[PDB]
């Protein structure tokens, strides 16, 4: 909109004269100025109003003769930054251009050192300024070594500078030699100077190539900004010198680009600028080959030269140039040649040179360029030749006329909209949309040119997923972009290398078939039925996906008129749907890397076929589909882990659709022959040693319908519960137990509720056994080599306890018992306070969903009013449970309730003493905020200490909860929470705590567990009485341990405790204890440490230990 940092900019420059000596301040200012200027790199035209004063505050500093060189360099840095931001072309029009600003600038530049790399910003800009002073309409002789000779020497010395200053020397000499008084004086000299440098220098050294590049740039700028009649005599010598250098063979891109830019300019000098020496015949010969270069920068530069040359030459040569450029599209070329040819054609059409005679040819090539994608390996190439085709089409709006384009508009408009929707690159889509808009605005003879732009504008061809299900249908709505649009998707995308292109195309065809059912059922389905026999792997998947999607669309369409699905598809096409499985089973295509893809495609095909109620029931095709599903659910470990969940969730869905469609004898019943075998085989498959077998069979058995569970529900439930039970053999079987609970939850949700029918649905006769299995898996805390995998088994154990509790609430809420509900609530509360973030978020979400459920309200909700007040509805979506900061402060408040105290504290102890740092830091702060409110009340503190001691006693000799609890106790004691219990001697609480700690530190070997014990033993010295003396003894037992690190840590902790609490040792003996704990190496041999230990014991009154 506008520049808003100017208020801060004028102050920055004001400090330029003060931060010129310091380095840190200068760097801060420079970095600051750069970050203030780079914000408007997209809006360079917004700084022009400020280009007046902003410059006066810079050049005015260097103009002052009473300033140091550091300030001059700092000002030139800002000047160069401003030039980079805005642009030298538009910024040098502001630089002084008087005859009295030339000798100043010259001496300024001559006071510089090319070796100083730090001041490179001063030499690059100064030269540019000189160019400005070269624009005065005065003679250099009037100013008076002469000025012209000095300028020529400076240019010659800078034109071979490896720094950026070389560029500044290009625009300089381009304006000094092209003058009236200096194009008859220095031009010939600089011409014999460039020829020598080009003939002597080589492209094998770094300095030889630098000089060559500089000379080429200087020559190209001179021939560009120079008189045509003046630089015409010297047009053959330079061309010969350039040809004798062999630049095309050199391995340099910039050199070739500059050579082409010079050749095109030299060619433009031979011809007169209108609305042909033999030398020109060579220039063209050096441009066409430029289109077949390896780099795109060379082709982009050669296209402009060719376009500029075809316009200064006759109409015979103009047509010959186009005819020669058209040869690049032969059958023996690569994509780079096609890209160069398209660029040349666009550059020629932009100026209006292509005649209608070349319409049959050009149009016969662009159609091949918009859909160019020739696989050149794992990925395909052609995105360059496609972007160029867009620009080529954009040029036809200015070249040909409506009368000359009407015969080909029917094919151009369709191709444009086809390439502006299903394209893979957003840039190509945007270019095609821009070309279509330009053609509609100029020609205006495109079918529905306005209606297509309003829906597919610049801000509409962005999301690729939206262009396949919104714009495609809108374009197919008309009868002019339907059959070709469908044929393109059928013969291009659905046979693409990427899989996202074979999924998006199928989804788009699904909707396209709704507007053209006849064409998709009589012309497209036969082509997708034969494409399945293609040996290509990407072709078979796409054809299967298309056959499934079109079939589903036809079924949905027929469902409207309650008409059968066979009305659109004939029986010949129907026989293909049956033989597709036999063809895949015979060739054995279910192997290798493509086997998983073929299985996934066939699964979706079978699912879409069963969801349409096809006439396949009672045929061998159903048996084949069932066998394939069983084999896929039988061999799961062979599939990669990157695509196992998809195959697991698709096979079960296909089986359910098949078992809920074909496998039925009458309404409310099913074929007993299949029911007596499928369930039996599955129950014989749920005891498979391989964990992946059960992981796939549990969900398959659970996804069965309700009519197929009548009478055999108890057996399925028993078989699923047998897997959820842990045993010595199934220790690390977490994925299997997860699927076991998922299948149970699915069965419960499907069967619903029905009293007086334990074998048909869930009722009060088996709800207790089901809840017992769900409540038992929550206590799983396995720690395998991978880590805490048990968490997974808990995830499915939470959702299974949610959807179930709601099911009864929507039918028979009286079945939910009070004890079971309270246990579930306490377990969810414990699971919503775990150090983990992803699992705690889901736990909190489930808790909120279960608490807010009031339709009808769920019975047996402990402290329902307090829970609702502590977790309002507004704090559900706004609070981020994944973040400990936005979770612990709200979860710690639950400790106030009696029920939510033991389990909540047990769950929070893991977070208050785990390994992560941020979680512990947040949990400690959240716990201190709550303890501050129950610090004065002795009853609350006593209850909290009792609950903590009970939790400690429960999880004894446990390395999952003992270490976290011991770590949290250290912080609890250091913060000063149990300050009321210190005013009484022989406190039972501190006695039982010390007793339990001695139990937990009994023979402790690991150093991680010993550190927490030592900390607790040193943070327990605060309690007076028998707990003070006895505890001290423990410290002594740790001062002569089996490791020196333990002794050192114990000594450090004792020294820290002696400084913390001063009332523990008298002042008369404190000095000796402090002096003995300082000049004593506790990491030495025990023979010398035992003496120090005995000395410390004799001073602290601790009885002498005994081995």
């Amino acid at each position: 909109e506008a520049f808003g940092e100017s208020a801060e900019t004028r102050a920055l420059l004001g400090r330029l004269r003060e931060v010129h000596g310091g380095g840190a301040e200068r760097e801060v200012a420079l970095e600051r100025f750069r970050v203030i200027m780079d914000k408007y790199q997209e809006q360079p035209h917004l700084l022009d109003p400020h280009l007046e004063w902003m410059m006066n505050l810079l050049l005015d500093i260097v103009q002052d003769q009473t300033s140091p060189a550091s300030l001059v360099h700092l000002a030139f840095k800002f000047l160069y930054i401003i030039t980079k931001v805005r642009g030298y072309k538009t910024f040098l029009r502001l630089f002084p251009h008087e005859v009295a600003d030339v000798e100043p600038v010259l001496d300024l530049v001559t006071i510089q050192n090319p070796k100083d790399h730090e001041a490179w910003e001063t030499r690059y800009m100064l030269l540019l300024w000189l160019s400005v002073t070269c624009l005065i309409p005065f003679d250099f002789s009037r100013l008076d070594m002469s000025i012209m000779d000095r300028i020529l020497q400076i240019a010659e010395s800078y034109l071979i500078v490896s720094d950026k200053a070389r560029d500044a020397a290009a625009v300089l000499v381009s304006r000094f030699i092209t003058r009236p008084d200096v194009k008859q004086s220095k031009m010939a000299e600089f011409l014999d100077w460039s020829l020598c440098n080009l003939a002597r220098s080589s492209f094998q050294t770094m300095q030889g190539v630098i000089t060559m590049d500089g000379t080429l740039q200087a020559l190209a700028q001179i021939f560009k900004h120079g008189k045509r009649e003046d630089c015409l005599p010297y047009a053959a010598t330079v061309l010969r010198c350039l040809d004798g250098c062999r630049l095309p063979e050199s391995n340099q891109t910039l050199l070739r680009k500059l050579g082409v830019k010079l050749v095109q300019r030299l060619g433009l000098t031979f011809l007169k600028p209108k609305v042909v020496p033999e030398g020109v015949e060579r220039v063209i010969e050096q441009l066409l080959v430029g289109l077949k270069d390896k780099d795109t920068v060379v082709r982009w530069s050669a296209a402009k030269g060719i376009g500029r040359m075809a316009g200064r030459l006759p109409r015979a040569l103009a047509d010959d140039v186009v005819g020669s450029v058209l040869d690049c599209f032969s059958f023996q070329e690569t994509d780079k040649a096609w890209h160069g040819g398209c660029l040349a054609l666009a550059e020629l059409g932009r100026r209006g040179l292509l005649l209608p005679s070349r319409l049959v040819d050009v149009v016969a090539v662009i159609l091949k360029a918009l859909t160019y994608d020739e696989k050149r390996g794992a990925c395909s190439v052609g995105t360059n030749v496609r972007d160029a085709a867009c620009y080529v089409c954009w040029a036809f709006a200015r070249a040909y006329e409506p009368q000359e384009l009407k015969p080909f508009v029917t094919a151009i408009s369709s191709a444009l909209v086809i390439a502006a929707v299903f394209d893979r690159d957003i840039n190509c889509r945007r270019a095609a949309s821009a070309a279509f808009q330009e053609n509609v605005g100029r020609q205006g003879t495109f079918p529905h040119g306005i209606d297509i732009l309003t829906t597919a504008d610049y801000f509409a061809v962005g999301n690729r997923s939206n262009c396949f299900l919104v714009i495609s249908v809108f374009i197919a709505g008309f009868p002019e972009y339907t059959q070709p649009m469908i044929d393109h998707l059928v013969t291009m995308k659905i046979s693409h290398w990427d899989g996202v292109i074979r999924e998006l195309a199928a989804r788009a065809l699904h909707n396209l078939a709704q507007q053209a059912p006849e064409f998709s059922a009589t012309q497209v389905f036969p082509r997708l039925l034969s494409m399945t026999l293609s040996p290509d792997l990407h072709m078979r998947h796409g054809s299967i996906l298309a056959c499934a999607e079109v079939a589903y669309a036809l079924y949905k369409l027929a469902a409207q008129e309650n008409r059968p699905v066979t009305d659109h598809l004939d029986e010949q096409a129907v026989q293909g749907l049956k033989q597709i499985h036999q063809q895949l089973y015979d060739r054995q295509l279910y192997r290798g890397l493509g086997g998983q893809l073929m299985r996934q495609a066939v699964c979706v095909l079978i699912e879409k076929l069963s969801l349409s109620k096809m006439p396949f029931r009672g045929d061998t095709v159903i048996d084949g589909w069932q066998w394939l599903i069983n084999d896929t659910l039988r061999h799961l470990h062979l599939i990669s882990s990157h695509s196992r969940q998809q195959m697991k969730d698709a096979a079960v869905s296909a089986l359910a659709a098949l078992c809920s469609e074909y496998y039925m004898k009458e309404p409310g019943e099913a074929d007993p022959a299949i029911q007596e075998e499928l369930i039996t085989q599955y129950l014989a498959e749920l005891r498979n040693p391989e964990e992946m077998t059960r992981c796939g069979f549990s969900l398959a058995l659970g996804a069965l319908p309700g009519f197929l569970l009548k009478g055999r529900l108890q057996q399925v439930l028993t078989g699923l519960r047998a897997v959820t039970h842990t045993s010595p053999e199934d220790v690390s079987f977490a994925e299997s137990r997860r699927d076991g609970l998922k299948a149970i939850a699915r069965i419960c949700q499907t069967v619903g509720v029905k009293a007086g029918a334990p074998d048909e649905a869930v009722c009060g006769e088996n709800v207790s056994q089901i809840y017992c299995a769900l409540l038992g898996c929550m206590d799983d805390y396995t720690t395998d080599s991978r880590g805490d995998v048990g968490t997974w088994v808990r995830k499915a154990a939470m959702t299974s306890l949610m959807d179930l509790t709601l099911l009864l609430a929507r039918s028979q809420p009286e079945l939910i018992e009070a004890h079971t509900c309270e246990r579930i609530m306490c377990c969810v509360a414990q699971q919503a306070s775990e150090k983990i973030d992803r699992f705690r978020a889901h736990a909190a979400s489930v808790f909120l969903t279960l608490l807010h459920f009031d339709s009808p309200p769920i019975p047996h909700v402990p402290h329902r009013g307090e829970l609702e007040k502590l977790f309002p509805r507004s704090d559900v979506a706004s609070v981020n449970w994944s973040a400990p900061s936005q979770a612990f402060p709200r979860i710690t408040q639950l400790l106030g309730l009696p029920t939510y105290r033991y389990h909540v504290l047990l769950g929070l102890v893991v977070s208050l003493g785990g390994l992560t740092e941020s979680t512990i830091r947040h949990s400690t702060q959240s716990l201190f905020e709550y303890m501050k409110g129950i610090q004065s009340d002795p009853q609350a503190l006593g209850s909290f200490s009792g609950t903590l001691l009970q939790i400690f006693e429960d999880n004894l000799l446990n390395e999952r909860v003992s270490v976290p609890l011991l770590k949290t106790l250290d912080h609890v004691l250091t913060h000063g929470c149990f300050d009321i219990f210190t005013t009484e001697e022989d406190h039972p609480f501190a006695v039982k705590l010390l007793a339990l700690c001695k139990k937990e530190i009994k023979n402790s070997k690991d150093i991680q567990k010993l550190l927490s014990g030592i900390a607790v033993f040193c943070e327990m010295v605060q309690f007076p009485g028998d707990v003070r003396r006895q505890a001290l003894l423990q410290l002594c037992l740790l001062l002569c341990h089996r490791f020196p690190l333990i002794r050192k840590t114990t000594a450090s902790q004792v020294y820290e405790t002696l400084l913390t609490y001063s009332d523990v040792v008298g002042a008369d003996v404190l000095d000796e204890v402090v002096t003995v704990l300082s000049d004593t190496a506790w990491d030495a041999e025990l023979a010398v440490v035992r003496e120090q230990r005995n000395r410390l014991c004799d001073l602290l009154g601790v009885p002498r230990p005994q081995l």
Partner: protein, 184 residues
């Protein structure tokens, strides 16, 4: 380079233009340039060089490069014909004794290869004077009908009073924007 970048680069050149202003000495060209931008007239001095002025108007950015009229500088006007979209030529109506001194230079400015394509605009200033010739007389004394390779449009205007100063630039912009393509 893609089509989007090409269009973005072409829009910058289509919106920005350059107007080379020339005229004999004391022809009233800087007194007309200051009025077009809104500045003081009582502080103008004989310029001995060239003046660049950038200003926004009707969305376009007019880069006016005005050169003096002294003979000594006439031999240095070859450094302003590059990237010139419009050529403004000021003519003093009261200078009916040097109308052939401005016709001899007008017949040498259109034949230039660089200026072959730009739109010409003749501004006959000093119309409020008593002995000021009308636009019809200037159109015949300068031989404007002979011109054919340029789109000329002689118009009578004034600087101190300001008359028809906006239409002069409006017509030039409309004529420059009508071209679909240009040379290079």
């Amino acid at each position: 380079m893609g089509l989007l970048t090409i269009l973005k680069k072409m829009k910058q050149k289509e919106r920005e233009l350059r107007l080379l202003m020339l005229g004999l000495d004391n022809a009233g060209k800087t007194t007309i340039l200051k009025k077009f931008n809104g500045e003081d007239i009582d502080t103008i001095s004989p310029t001995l060089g060239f003046n660049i002025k950038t200003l926004e108007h009707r969305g376009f950015k007019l880069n006016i490069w005005d050169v003096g009229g002294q003979k000594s500088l006439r031999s240095y006007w070859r450094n302003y014909f590059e990237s010139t979209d419009g050529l403004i030529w000021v003519v003093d109506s009261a200078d009916r004794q040097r109308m052939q001194d401005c016709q001899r230079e007008l017949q040498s400015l259109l034949v230039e290869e660089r200026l072959a394509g730009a739109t010409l605009l003749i501004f006959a200033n000093k119309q409020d004077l008593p002995g000021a010739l009308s636009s019809n007389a200037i159109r015949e004394v300068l031989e404007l009908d002979s011109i054919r390779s340029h789109h000329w449009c002689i118009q009578g205007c004034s600087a101190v009073t300001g008359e028809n100063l906006l239409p002069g630039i409006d017509w030039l912009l409309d004529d420059i924007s009508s071209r679909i393509f240009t040379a290079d």
